[PDB]
Structures are given as C-alpha cells and as structure tokens.
Design a protein around this ligand. Structure first.
Ligand SMILES: [Mg+2]
Ligand SMILES: [Mg+2]
Lengths: 71, 71
C-alpha cells in the first residue's frame, strides 16, 4: 500500500503499471527531499561543533582527527 | 541523555564540555552517514523508475515532467 511495500513486493519492473511508476516516483522524490533536509541539518551540527572545538585550540586533537571525525 | 535532547536543550555552545562535544560530533557524523546512504537509495529508485518510464515511451509524460518529477 505504501510506496515502500509496493516497491519491495515487486520482482519485475515491467509488471508495474505507468500509474504505479508515476505514483512511486513522486513518493520517492518526496522522501528524497525530506532526507536531504535531514542530511543538511546533520552537516550543520557537525559544522558548528568542529568550529567550537577549533575555537578552543583544537584540544589535543590532531587536524586529521578533526577532519575525519576519528574519536 | 540522548544526543537529540542534550543538543536541543543547549542554549549556549560554550557551556558544553569538550567530552560532550566529541560525543555529539561522533553521533551526528554516523547519523549523517546513515542518512546519506538512504538518500542514495532513494536516488537509485527514482533513477530506476525514470528509466523504466522512458523505456516504455507512450508520451505519458513530457521530458520536463520526467525531469522535475511533475506527475
Ligand atoms: Mg565549518
Ligand atoms: Mg539510469
């Protein structure tokens, strides 16, 4: 019923009607956008945090640890 | 106790210890990675559906409706 279920319960792409594919695309395009928003929020948080740590002198964290988020 | 709450509840960035800074960066970084993976999955699906629709033709949709996902 949900896009996920329909998509998942399909073994053959060609069995899907155009109405289905249209509906699925819109659904996934919608989600993709909601997911990207979430990514950007995470990136912002990571961003603010890395600047705060750098502001304090980097602690004793090497530049590469800061850039790779190894901790 | 969850990162979501410690972070949502912080008024002043400078009030956060360095220990908790590192914890939050670590949590959000991994979250960022998981979210990016889903994005990529969605894009993979939109890609598969868009190819399928193109393959069939039928002028069901105009090039700009396929491209902007205007159903
Ligand atoms: Mg920055
Ligand atoms: Mg393709």
């Amino acid at each position: 019923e949900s896009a996920e279920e329909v998509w998942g319960g399909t073994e053959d792409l060609t069995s899907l009607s155009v109405e289905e594919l249209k509906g699925l695309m819109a659904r996934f395009d919608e989600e993709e956008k909601r997911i990207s928003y979430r990514r950007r929020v995470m990136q912002g948080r990571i961003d603010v945090i890395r600047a705060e740590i750098v502001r304090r002198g980097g602690a004793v964290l090497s530049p590469e640890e800061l850039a790779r988020v190894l901790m």
